[PDB]
């Protein structure tokens, strides 16, 4: 069996696999990510865990893996219906929360520094702990940077629109939502997701991207729509294949967006912003420092959010289930589910 | 992790792809001294809605699957009682979920497993369901349910629709009320590629029907309203192809036991099914049940039948959920991206 702690971060589910995880081939976490995304056994495992009947169209499964850096408490990789991913703020917060509240990592009060090894690098997480509860977690995200601002693409549905290509631990296309004639709110969840899936297909087909120093991280993962609320918060809706919205404000997406703000002169070291998701849940987003990635101007972002352990689950690793290969349908998985 | 926490313990089972989580420990006391009373309570009391919402909506629940609350048996012949929690309401009856419950009771050992066969009597708000389980080496391989008395209310009820014009449906009962609709009338076939469009049609029809076509069981007032619109067809091999659509908008993954029970009553009324007959039914994902006509009977003086439904349950995991009314999202939530077109009414 695989043992999971079921956690949500600002409404976004991150199941944290804390026991019974199989050995994942690779001498680095980046190699393990590559293996998961290329080997048939990697596909089999992911499908088994994420698709029906064992998985749901919402949430990710975070595989805890052996740390390699001596300062890392654990390593992890994020499993989703599309692929394995290197990075995620909401899931890093879920992993931190699970590690501390399970006692796998010793909880110190008022703060515990937890170090998570990802394919993108080490994520340093400062957890505010009180009375055995991990209340919130401030992530120091990996160096984030602009790939290109104001990229134009032709769309049959909305004509020419512009997006920012950028990196916040995985690659994003950021789109001002007014360009597709929608607004970010709950009532538009399906239509926003439909637009995001059209854009992701177009972008993935025509706009290849790879991290200049980490070959295993490539392609635009998600299209994130952005707007501004009246109180000044960065409103976001990250669209995820085969078609659903992130329930959290999106840590990696905010990290990538913060890099665009900094490039435009709209954010500076020391600034703190609020970001709000489609459901109104919130993160604090900070610009901690400037840096460089392979000669490119870059930043060190911070993402602060809360994790809530809501349950425990154990899944039988029985490959004889008649539904062991897993399935999905467009009723609840989104418009591209037929491609699963 | 859960130290110091109040939890509900569940066995996670699927029946032909349809998830039935079975709550076997830490279920709160549900007020009522009959199961029908407990069903009414869940569907009318604020605390009932609170509990259901907490368990079935995000972040704790997903848009697929049901939560089956095991409850004390009242009837002297019953081994256990249960009620089905879904995003729309609590429901009296479910074929797939009765199979999940039986599987979980027997494999956990809560009910003693006998080989080659164990009979488990489940008490529902609709009546007793006899579950005859084929068992071997500690596994409940498959379950034949004797369903509650099923009957026709009216065949070929006409209804005007803006999209498809006037169409016909059968109003009937298989442990809950159904509108059964030949799927050619909406210009779609039942298949995985049409899941979203079938569900959209099912929801339009459910809203129209619930507004204009009240129904109530003539002897069990707690069971009322058309629960589901089920689309039906016949495959090339003669299987009864089904797609039951569930509010706020998804398809049953199973062939639908209660829906097949209601459909079998319509076949019987049409002279197309007799005592002893057996049919196969297939779901939108191609999973299958055996559907039998065991006997004729009467419900409140009306002609009825006793159907059987045979399918397989499979325990895929265990889960525990913390009952924490102080979670900031204790009220639960849903969105139209994954919950279907009527999710905004949650």
Domains and CATH numbers, chain B: 1-147+312-346 (3.10.310.10), 148-311 (3.10.310.10)
Task: Decide if A47 touches B, using CB distance below 8 A.
Answer: no
Q: What are phi and psi of B148, to 5 degrees?
A: -65, 160
Buried b / exposed e over B141-156, threshold 16 CB at 10 Å, is: ebbbbbbbbbbbbeee
User: Are A115 and A125 contacting, i.e. CB atoms less than 8 angstroms apart?
Assistant: yes
Closest CA to A170 of A224, A242, A99: A224
Element (H, E) at B302: strand B302-311
A252 is in an annotated binding site: yes
State the resolution, in angstroms.
1.8
Closest CA to B300 of B213, B214, B221, B210: B221
Closest CA to A318 of A4, A7, A14, A53: A53
Listed by number, the residues of chain A in 190-219 with a beta carbon closer than 8 Å to a beta carbon of chain B are 190, 192-193
Residue A131 CB coordination number (10 Å)? 7
Contact call for A327 and B285, based on CB within 8 A? yes
User: Are B129 and B174 contacting, i.e. CB atoms less than 8 angstroms apart?
Assistant: no
* Residue A262 zone, left/alpha/beta (φ > 0; ψ -120 to 50; rest): alpha
B95 is in an annotated binding site: yes
Q: What are phi and psi of B195, to 5 degrees?
A: -55, -50
User: Are B54 and B60 contacting, i.e. CB atoms less than 8 angstroms apart?
Assistant: yes
Q: Say how far apart CA A97 and CA A127 lie, in whole Å.
A: 8
User: Are A59 and A52 contacting, i.e. CB atoms less than 8 angstroms apart?
Assistant: no
Q: Say how far apart CA A334 and CA B249 lie, in whole Å.
A: 12
Residue written as tokens 């095991």?
B70
Closest CA to A38 of A24, A50, A27, A22: A24
A113 in helix, strand or coil? strand
Element (H, E) at A138: strand A133-140
Residues belonging to chain B: 346
Catalytic residue selected from B15, B66, B93, B94: B94
Contact call for A331 and B340, based on CB within 8 A? yes
**DSSP 8-state code for residue A337:** G
Q: Say how far apart CA B45 and CA A98 lie, in whole Å.
A: 35
Q: What is the dihedral of CA B64, A313, B68, A333, to 10 degrees?
A: 0
Report residue B222 as tokens: 């707690």
Q: Say how far apart CA B181 and CA A3 lie, in whole Å.
A: 43
Residue A140 CB coordination number (10 Å)? 18
User: Which pairs with CB-CB distance under 8 Å and at least 24 residues apart come from A26-29?
Assistant: A27/A68, A28/A68, A28/A119, A29/A65, A29/A68, A29/A75, A29/A77, A29/A117, A29/A118, A29/A119
Q: What are phi and psi of A237, to 5 degrees?
A: -145, 100
Reply yes or no on whether A102 is catalytic: no
Can you say whether the dihedral through the CA atoms of B129, B135, B138, B143 is positive or negative? negative
Reply yes or no on whether A250 is catalytic: yes
Residue A256 CB coordination number (10 Å)? 31
Contacts of B2 in chain A (CB under 8 A): 309, 311-312
Residue B257 CA from chain centroid, whole number: 7
Pairing of strands B7-15, A111-118: unpaired
A311 is in an annotated binding site: no
Pairing of strands B151-161, B165-173: antiparallel
User: Are A180 and A193 contacting, i.e. CB atoms less than 8 angstroms apart?
Assistant: no
Catalytic residue selected from A60, A87, A88, A248: A88
What pairs with residue B80 in β-bridges? Answer: B122
Q: Say how far apart CA B148 and CA B306 lie, in whole Å.
A: 6
Residue A128 CB coordination number (10 Å)? 16
Tell me the C-alpha to C-alpha distance, in Å, between residue B287 and each of A315, B191, B252, B312. Answer: 22, 12, 11, 10
Contact call for B316 and A315, based on CB within 8 A? yes
Report residue B228 as tokens: 């589901």
Q: According to the entry, how was the structure determined?
A: X-ray
Closest CA to B69 of B150, B125, B111: B125
Contact call for B317 and A316, based on CB within 8 A? yes
The nearest alpha carbon in chain B to A197 belongs to B337
Listed by number, the residues of chain A in 281-340 with a beta carbon closer than 8 Å to a beta carbon of chain B are 306, 308-316, 318, 321-323, 327, 329-335, 337-338
Q: CB-side exposure of B218: number of CA atoms within 13 Å?
A: 14
Contacts of B323 in chain A (CB under 8 A): none
Listed by number, the residues of chain A in 101-130 with a beta carbon closer than 8 Å to a beta carbon of chain B are 101-102
* Residue B272 zone, left/alpha/beta (φ > 0; ψ -120 to 50; rest): alpha
* Residue B225 zone, left/alpha/beta (φ > 0; ψ -120 to 50; rest): left
B258 is in an annotated binding site: yes
Residue written as tokens 């009240």?
B214
A28 is in an annotated binding site: no
A183 in helix, strand or coil? coil
Contacts of A193 in chain B (CB under 8 A): 337
Contacts of B324 in chain A (CB under 8 A): 310
């Amino acid at each position: 069996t695989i043992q999971l702690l079921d956690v949500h971060c600002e409404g976004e589910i991150g199941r944290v696999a804390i026991g019974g995880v199989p050995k994942i081939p690779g001498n680095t976490v980046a190699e393990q990510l590559h293996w998961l995304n290329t080997d048939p056994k990697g596909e089999e495992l992911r499908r088994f865990l994420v698709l029906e009947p064992r998985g749901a169209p919402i949430g990710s499964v975070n595989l805890l893996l052996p740390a390699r850096h001596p300062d890392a408490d654990a390593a992890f990789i994020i499993l989703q219906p599309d692929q394995a991913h290197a990075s995620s703020g909401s899931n890093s917060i879920c992993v931190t929360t699970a590690l501390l509240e399970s006692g796998i990592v010793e909880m110190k009060e008022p703060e515990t520094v937890v170090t998570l090894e990802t394919a993108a690098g080490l994520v340093r997480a400062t957890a505010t702990c009180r009375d055995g509860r991990c209340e919130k977690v401030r992530l120091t995200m990996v160096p984030s940077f602009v790939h290109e601002l104001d990229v134009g693409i032709d769309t049959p549905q909305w004509g020419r629109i512009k997006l920012d290509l950028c990196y916040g631990g995985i690659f994003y296309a950021l789109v001002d939502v007014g360009q597709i004639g929608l607004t970010i709110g709950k009532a538009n969840a399906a239509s926003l997701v439909q637009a995001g899936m059209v854009l992701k297909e177009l972008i993935n087909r025509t706009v290849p991207v790879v991290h200049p120093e980490i070959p295993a991280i490539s392609g635009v993962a998600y299209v994130m729509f952005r707007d501004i609320d009246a109180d000044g918060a960065i409103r976001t809706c990250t669209t995820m294949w085969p078609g659903r919205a992130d329930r959290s404000p999106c840590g990696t997406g905010n990290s990538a967006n913060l890099a665009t703000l900094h490039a435009r002169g709209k954010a500076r070291v020391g600034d703190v912003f609020k970001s709000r998701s489609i459901i109104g849940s919130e993160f604090e987003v900070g610009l901690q420092a400037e840096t460089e990635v392979a000669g490119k101007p870059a930043i060190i972002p911070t993402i602060t959010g809360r994790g809530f352990t809501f349950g425990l689950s154990q899944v039988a690793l029985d490959p004889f289930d008649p539904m062991a290969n897993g399935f999905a349908l467009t009723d609840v998985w989104g418009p591209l589910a037929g491609d699963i």
